[PDB]
């Protein structure tokens, strides 16, 4: 009698055969299915309710019954036909962790993480057939996120005067649950739902240093936190997390691939803040064409080529859009590019040739070379994001923003149509270092979360 | 019940590759009820269906409206009729005490509502045959936005094709009544969108109606500001924003089902301008297919978001971001481009004061202390002010000292935010060139696109 034998294990906290992965327990489920055939739903509930040593917990007994229902009716030849049994049991299993004193909760914690990974993969595959199953997009994964969110809400820290140092299972998987939930929100194209998860993470944590969590869970959290910040156009906030996540990673081929994932975001984020990587240490994580691609953009930005930056983004438009990088790069890269273009002008005009007054006509000639074609010009009669923003006519506007961002120490004389800088040979007095100026104006949230 | 088939089951696949090796045998499982979390608006045209009693009952209400000349007697007659109607409609399963609700009101305003508004004297002159008529015209009255408790009856809600008919009537007859009719049009257009929500309908009629209503909102924004007629800018933009959210949601659902909407790019572009500084809309637009992202209207809107972005933009709850362009000069150049769609320009006129303030705020920081006041002629051309009176009023609002009545002393600008604490916002304004473009076209042509 396998059904009685299974119930004996579950009643005593033994969950060896309590899984949805038939690759692990298919033989026992096959025997269970044959023996359970013929018993209706009421009898399966009676088997659990009447079983000796069964915990007197409604949710635990509901969980056991749903597994028996799963075993009886599972169709291994159809994932879709069995999905309702699988998803129903998973919800029942997670409900067994909501109460912090639920029976066998500590033994259930490894089962819940193991089953969560199974159900997340299955929900993703089912969602890809949303048209055929007549379900809305991301319906399966969004349901999982709903279940995992409720488990997240039920996690609380012990008292401030706890009698022991014990870390309960719910606290042990807190960051694991956070990363799983935020990964789902990114997958279902609603990453702003991470906001609640990020805000309530630390208050629920009993550890009072973020570095006490597992390093791999630390790195993924910073990766997702940086991506969330970058989606809000908060570049410096994202950079600090991206930079700290990658440095911790440097201290498996999956680790190498994960490092590449950070780099895809860290490189453009650092570039906006006037920081460029050393390509040497990055070789194990990046293919040579990736290095060459960013190096071309590095060349355009470093020497103040506005048209080159626009054309580079145009070439890379599709894959930048897939990572939500196109808009932030298109908006916040020009001012770094403009600073470098203006810096070279002042280096020759002021520090070398001694002229502290810069006529606007000189800047317009410089800007005409850098920007090139614009929406108004012949040959480009339709507006694009690549020819519709920058125009050499707007000399004063370019200078004003550079000054207002702290990147250019200068005075503007609109009636005289000239720009006045300090009389010096030291260029850094007129054009200070970019990264220091930006980070001083926009301080970031500390890399030390707590 | 759950979907069991041959094609779907084969496509989704098995749980494991070879179940029979593990001891499983193929069993004919009974059909199981669909789980609660897999329950699923309508995206395709449905044929209009009306219950025979509902059709007969509505025809009696119209007949009684013609026969009973006393206003209060007719209303009380239809009141007791409506009480009978609700229970019968409840018994038929066509209204709740889920039901796929279908509206069956074939007028632009339900007959019961017409009689009610006769008693409350809330009928507009636009809804009467003649101004002094005691009765609301059946062919002119428009259903108001419902502000109730009981669920609306089928006779209260217009079906999608009647909703299109109502908007067609508004476009053909009521656009030229602006700005006087703005309160009427805003409420009636809100009701048209409400009826679609009542039926949970997102078919082509809902897309077409929401699209043209959004266009009407953009036309209204310029007409009210130009005519200096007092109105709630907030209420006009809220409904305009809500209709854009609805359109985005229908565009998403249509894409998921494999269809297309011809006008999606135009209204994705409008949505990019509803919250010009919200990074959310930059994120969402990047997810869309290439042909939507690269459409000239979307590209134009994206340019405006870039030029308007400012690292000094100051407002409670707004997070400043790095390296923003603050390209006010480019903004006013783009504003004057003949390739700028007129309704799109009407949307962007909402930010004229904000862009102007931060232009003066940024320029003043580049001036040294000895610098003379900036001549108005320079600022008028740089900020595209309509006339000398507008720039004078602008400087007065922000306490910018005016010297000799023709120059602004920019160092006297003490505010760091466009929004003043204990003051009403500056009177909204417009651009002369956009007004001239409006006078060279028709309202109907703009709304119909």
């Amino acid at each position: 009698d396998m059904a009685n034998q299974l119930l004996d294990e579950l009643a005593h906290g033994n969950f060896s055969h309590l899984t949805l992965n038939l690759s692990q327990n298919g033989r026992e489920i096959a025997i269970l299915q044959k023996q359970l055939t013929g018993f209706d739903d009421k009898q399966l509930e009676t088997f659990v309710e009447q079983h000796p040593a069964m915990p007197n917990d409604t949710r635990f007994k509901i969980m056991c019954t749903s597994f028996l229902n799963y075993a009886r009716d599972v169709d291994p030849w159809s994932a879709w036909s069995s999905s309702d049994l699988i998803f129903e049991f998973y919800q029942c299993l997670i409900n067994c962790l909501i109460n912090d004193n639920a029976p066998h909760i500590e033994m259930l914690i490894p089962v819940a993480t193991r089953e969560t990974e199974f159900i997340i993969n299955l929900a993703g595959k089912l969602d890809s057939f949303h048209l055929q199953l007549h379900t809305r997009s991301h319906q399966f994964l969004s349901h999982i996120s709903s279940i995992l969110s409720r488990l997240f809400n039920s996690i609380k820290p012990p008292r401030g005067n706890a009698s022991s140092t014990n870390i309960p299972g719910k606290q042990r998987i807190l960051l694991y649950l956070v990363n799983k939930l935020n990964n789902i929100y990114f997958r279902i194209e609603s990453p702003q739902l991470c906001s609640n998860i990020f805000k309530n993470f630390q208050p629920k944590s009993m550890l009072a240093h973020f570095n006490e969590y597992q390093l791999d869970q630390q790195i993924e959290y910073r990766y997702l936190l940086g991506r969330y910040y970058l989606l809000n156009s908060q570049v410096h906030n994202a950079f600090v997390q991206f930079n700290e996540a990658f440095q911790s990673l440097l201290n498996n081929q999956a680790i190498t691939r994960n490092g590449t994932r950070i780099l895809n975001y860290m490189i453009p984020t650092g570039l906006i803040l006037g920081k460029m990587v050393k390509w040497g240490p990055l070789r194990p994580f990046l293919s040579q064409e990736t290095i060459d691609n960013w190096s071309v953009l590095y060349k355009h930005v470093r020497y103040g080529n506005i048209q080159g930056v626009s054309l580079w983004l145009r070439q890379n438009e599709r894959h930048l859009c897939a990572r939500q990088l196109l808009i932030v790069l298109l908006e916040k890269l020009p001012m770094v590019t403009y600073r470098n273009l203006i810096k070279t002008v002042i280096k020759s005009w002021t520090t070398e040739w001694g002229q502290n007054k810069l006529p606007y006509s000189l800047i317009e000639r410089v800007l005409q070379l850098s920007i090139g074609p614009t929406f108004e010009d012949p040959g480009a009669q339709e507006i694009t994001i690549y020819n519709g923003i920058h125009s050499p006519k707007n000399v004063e506007n370019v200078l004003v923003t550079l000054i207002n961002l702290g990147l250019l120490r200068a005075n503007c004389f609109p009636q005289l149509q000239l720009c006045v800088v300090k009389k010096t040979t030291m260029i850094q007095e007129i054009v200070p270092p970019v990264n220091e100026r930006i980070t001083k104006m926009f301080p970031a949230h500390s890399h030390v979360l707590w | 019940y759950m979907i069991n088939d041959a094609k779907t089951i084969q496509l989704v696949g098995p749980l494991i590759s070879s179940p029979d090796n593990l001891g499983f045998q193929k069993r004919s499982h009974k059909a199981r009820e669909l789980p609660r979390f897999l329950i699923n608006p309508q995206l395709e045209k449905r044929a209009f269906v009306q219950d025979p009693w509902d059709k007969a009952n509505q025809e009696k209400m119209i007949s009684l409206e013609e026969s009973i000349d006393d206003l209060n007697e007719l209303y009380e007659t239809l009141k007791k009729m409506r009480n009978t109607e609700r229970s019968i409609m409840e018994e038929k399963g066509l209204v709740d005490k889920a039901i796929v609700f279908q509206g069956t009101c074939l007028d632009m305003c339900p007959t019961f509502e017409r009689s009610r508004r006769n008693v409350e004297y809330t009928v507009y002159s636009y809804e009467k045959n003649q101004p002094n008529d005691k009765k609301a015209s059946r062919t002119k009255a428009l259903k108001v936005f419902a502000r109730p408790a009981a669920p609306p009856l089928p006779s209260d809600v217009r079906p999608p094709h009647i909703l299109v008919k109502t908007l067609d009537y508004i476009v053909d007859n009521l656009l030229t009544t602006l700005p006087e009719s703005e309160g009427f049009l805003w409420d009636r257009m809100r009701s048209i969108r409400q009826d679609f929500t009542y039926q949970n309908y997102s078919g082509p009629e809902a897309v077409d109606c929401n699209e043209r209503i959004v266009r009407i909102h953009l036309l209204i924004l310029h007409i009210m500001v130009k005519s200096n007629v007092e109105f709630s800018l907030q209420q006009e933009l809220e409904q305009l924003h809500k209709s854009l959210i609805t359109l985005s949601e229908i565009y998403d659902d249509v894409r998921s089902s494999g269809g297309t909407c011809p006008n999606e790019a135009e209204f994705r572009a409008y949505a990019l301008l509803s919250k010009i500084r919200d990074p959310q809309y930059d994120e969402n637009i990047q997810r869309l297919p290439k042909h939507i992202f690269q459409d000239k209207l979307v590209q134009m809107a994206l340019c405006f978001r870039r030029v308007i972005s400012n690292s000094a933009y100051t407002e409670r709850g707004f997070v400043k971001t790095e390296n923003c362009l603050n390209f006010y000069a480019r903004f006013f150049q783009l504003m004057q481009s003949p390739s700028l769609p007129l309704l799109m320009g009407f949307f962007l006129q909402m930010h004229l004061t904000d862009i102007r303030f931060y232009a003066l705020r940024a320029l003043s920081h580049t001036l040294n202390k000895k610098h003379k006041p900036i001549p108005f002629i320079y600022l008028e051309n740089m900020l595209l002010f309509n006339n000398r009176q507008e720039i004078i009023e602008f400087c007065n609002y922000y306490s910018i000292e005016i010297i000799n009545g023709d120059a602004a002393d920019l160092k006297t600008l003490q505010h760091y935010s466009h929004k003043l604490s204990e003051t009403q916002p500056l009177k909204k304004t417009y651009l002369t060139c956009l007004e001239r473009r409006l006078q060279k076209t028709t309202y109907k042509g703009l709304i119909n696109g």
């Binding site: 702290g406 120490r409 005075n411 006045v420 800088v421 | 920081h365 580049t366 040294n368 202390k369």
Partner: peptide
């Protein structure tokens, strides 16, 4: 006519 710093206003 010379450069006068306005970092206090800028920052």
């Amino acid at each position: 006519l010379e450069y006068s710093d306005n970092e206090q206003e800028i920052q």
